[PDB]
Design an enzyme around this catalytic site. Structure first.
Site, PDB file in Angstrom:
ATOM      1  N   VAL A  57       1.618  -0.846   6.205  1.00  0.00           N
ATOM      2  CA  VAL A  57       1.281  -0.954   7.616  1.00  0.00           C
ATOM      3  C   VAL A  57      -0.158  -1.400   7.820  1.00  0.00           C
ATOM      4  CG1 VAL A  57       0.901   0.433   9.729  1.00  0.00           C
ATOM      5  CG2 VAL A  57       3.061   0.612   8.458  1.00  0.00           C
ATOM      6  N   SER A  58      -1.086  -0.904   7.008  1.00  0.00           N
ATOM      7  CA  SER A  58      -2.501  -1.093   7.299  1.00  0.00           C
ATOM      8  C   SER A  58      -3.264  -1.772   6.169  1.00  0.00           C
ATOM      9  CB  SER A  58      -3.110   0.254   7.725  1.00  0.00           C
ATOM     10  OG  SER A  58      -4.497   0.135   7.960  1.00  0.00           O
ATOM     11  N   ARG A  59      -3.346  -1.163   4.982  1.00  0.00           N
ATOM     12  CA  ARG A  59      -4.175  -1.726   3.908  1.00  0.00           C
ATOM     13  C   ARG A  59      -3.641  -3.064   3.394  1.00  0.00           C
ATOM     14  NH1 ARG A  59      -4.436   3.827   0.623  1.00  0.00           N
ATOM     15  NH2 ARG A  59      -2.479   4.016   1.814  1.00  0.00           N
ATOM     16  N   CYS A  91       0.859  -1.177   0.000  1.00  0.00           N
ATOM     17  CA  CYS A  91       0.000   0.000   0.000  1.00  0.00           C
ATOM     18  C   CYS A  91       0.899   1.231   0.000  1.00  0.00           C
ATOM     19  CB  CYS A  91      -0.993  -0.084   1.168  1.00  0.00           C
ATOM     20  SG  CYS A  91      -0.285  -0.514   2.768  1.00  0.00           S
ATOM     21  N   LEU A  92       0.572   2.271   0.768  1.00  0.00           N
ATOM     22  CA  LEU A  92       1.522   3.374   0.873  1.00  0.00           C
ATOM     23  C   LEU A  92       2.654   3.026   1.836  1.00  0.00           C
ATOM     24  CD1 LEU A  92       1.971   6.403  -0.125  1.00  0.00           C
ATOM     25  CD2 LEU A  92       1.089   6.991   2.128  1.00  0.00           C
ATOM     26  N   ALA A  93       2.315   2.740   3.097  1.00  0.00           N
ATOM     27  CA  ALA A  93       3.295   2.482   4.149  1.00  0.00           C
ATOM     28  C   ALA A  93       3.573   1.000   4.379  1.00  0.00           C
ATOM     29  CB  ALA A  93       2.813   3.115   5.462  1.00  0.00           C
TER      30      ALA A  93
END
Length: 156
Positions: A94-96, A90-92
């Site tokens: 970390v989450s998605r 995803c972007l980081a």
């Protein structure tokens, strides 16, 4: 750090990273990545030599990821069954992307979401799904993961 330190192996043939890792030719070659599941705003195929699945999910409290679990699991699983390697990012990282990989792990094991998250964190310590995705994962564990495991058995 808050975007990890490079893409990390979670299981054989399954990696998580940030958007920069997903363009890093040295990382992709060393980890033999040939499939990329990109789950962020405006995700599109970028590189040669890579099969993409792009899911345009926002980092927002309203974003639904459950409706993308099935397509994501099929993409990851068919890659891994061919002996190839998939990066989810995803972007980081970390989450998605972590949420999709948790749903995958829950479907190919008997794990609930917390043990799946522990598995992700063993490879990528920064993993931390946003609270909305935790709620979606808990609901998935309660009502749906058993159906997904049966679907996986019937399909593969």
């Amino acid at each position: 750090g808050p975007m990890g330190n490079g893409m990390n192996k979670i299981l054989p043939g399954l990696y998580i990273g940030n958007f920069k890792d997903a363009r890093d030719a040295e990382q992709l070659s060393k980890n033999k990545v040939t499939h990329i599941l990109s789950v962020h705003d405006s995700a599109r195929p970028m590189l040669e030599g890579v099969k993409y699945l792009c899911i345009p999910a926002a980092d927002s409290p309203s974003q639904n990821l459950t409706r993308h679990f099935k397509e994501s699991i099929k993409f990851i699983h068919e890659c891994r069954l061919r002996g190839e390697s998939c990066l989810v990012h995803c972007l980081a990282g970390v989450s998605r992307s972590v949420t999709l990989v948790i749903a995958y792990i829950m479907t190919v094991t008997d794990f609930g979401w917390e043990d799946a998250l522990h598995t992700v964190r063993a490879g990528r310590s920064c993993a931390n799904p946003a609270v909305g995705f935790q709620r979606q994962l808990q609901e998935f564990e309660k009502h749906e993961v058993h159906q997904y495991r049966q679907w996986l058995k019937e399909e593969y």
